[PDB]
Amino acid sequence: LHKEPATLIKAIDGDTVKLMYKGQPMTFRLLLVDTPEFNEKYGPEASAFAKKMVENAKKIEVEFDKGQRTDKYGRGLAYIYADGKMVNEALVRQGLAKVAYVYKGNNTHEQLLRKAEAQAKKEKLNIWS
Ligand SMILES: Cc1cn([C@H]2C[C@H](OP(=O)(O)O)[C@@H](COP(=O)(O)O)O2)c(=O)[nH]c1=O
Ligand SMILES: [Ca+2]
């Protein structure tokens, strides 16, 4: 996989964010994770964590997987990096997201994320508390 440039337009919630990619505004949905909706338990904390991450970053990057790059709602599907750290992974590692929506052929970082989930679960963090 390859990291590509993007810039932040606006934080949205734990697992979606608005970025400019190839010069065009798009909403990205983070691959392989599910954060709680803002209205649910840990939703506000997931949103806050994801917002801090992308707002503090000097460099945002988008990494597509091998399969579909847009979902049925026209959201981009990608792994999002903030100053080299994967947002998808960081949410999971903090117990603010579950590994989820693992579809065949867009699952390159599955085992990396499951390893983070296991560690979050072990330390009983947030969702796992
Ligand atoms: C993460 C992801 C979500 N989706 C679709 C599945 C779900 O369909 P449904 O809306 O029919 O439940 C929805 C979940 O996104 P959200 O968790 O943002 O609601 O997005 C994909 O198709 N591919 C993906 O990789
Ligand atoms: Ca969600």
- Residue 93 CA to residue 45 CA, distance in Å, equals 14
CB 22 within 8 A of CB 7: no
Residues forming the active site: 29, 37, 75
Name the closest ligand to CA 13: 2
Smallest CA-to-CA distance from 113 within 70, 71, 80 is with 80
Among all ligands shown, which has an atom nearest to the Cα of 50? 2
Reported CATH class of domain 1-129: mainly beta
Residue 97 Cβ < 6 Å to ligand 1: no
Contact by Cβ (8 Å): 43, 35 = yes
- Method of elucidation: X-ray
Q: Tell me which residue has its CA closest to atom 12 in ligand 1.
A: 101
Closest CA to 51 of 2, 90, 93: 90
Centre of ligand 1 to C-alpha 73, Å, is 8
